[PDB]
Amino acid sequence: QVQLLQPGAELVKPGASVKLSCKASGYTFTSYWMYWVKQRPGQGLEWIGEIDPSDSYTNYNQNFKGKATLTVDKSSSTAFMQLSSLTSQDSAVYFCARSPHYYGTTYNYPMDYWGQGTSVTVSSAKTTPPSVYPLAPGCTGSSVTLGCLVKGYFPESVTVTWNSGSLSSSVHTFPALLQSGLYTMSSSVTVPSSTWPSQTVTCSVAHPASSTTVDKKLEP
């Protein structure tokens, strides 16, 4: 019922600013703190600061006192974080998170509800759609493994679905890696041999950033 809506991803050029939004529903926006949290890929969590949405009172982590600025829109129950002078060191996932506020008291509280996060890429590279290549055996067995190679795209990320999503019991999604400013990922699927190539096997590759969706059928 209680939820916080953050946009998925953001691509911004170095030195520029970005304004991240956190829409709140299911509770009274002004009765709770709004916190923001930074996480770098594969690392820990940093508390950036807090806003009291009732009076826009703000308190910042010392290490962010010139980078981040917290505002709210009471009427629309939305919280914003302004990030300035962006470097590659600002490429991270940014969470907004609610915290209970018991006013005239000595209790402080943790974060009980979080948004999904906005992953911010800071880069000069242009948004480019992926090339999708099928992976079929090139010479037999009980079951057969097929794949789909997604190469040369920017920014992250893509989603790969097999057979419109009905296949997921034995699907491996391999994390994207970066070569020469371009991302490459891989997706694998394992099916009984009596199904392929007698039936249809397709990988749909969606790349939201460039509004791309490419289907590829797998041929022996």
């Binding site: 009274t28 002004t30 009765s31 009732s54 009076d55 209970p100 506020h101 018991y102 006013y103 005239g104 008291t105």
Partner: peptide, 18 residues
Amino acid sequence: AKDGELPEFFERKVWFKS
């Protein structure tokens, strides 16, 4: 009067805000 609303959770017997 100041904020236009009131906190959902506050201590009555102190000056809990502002």
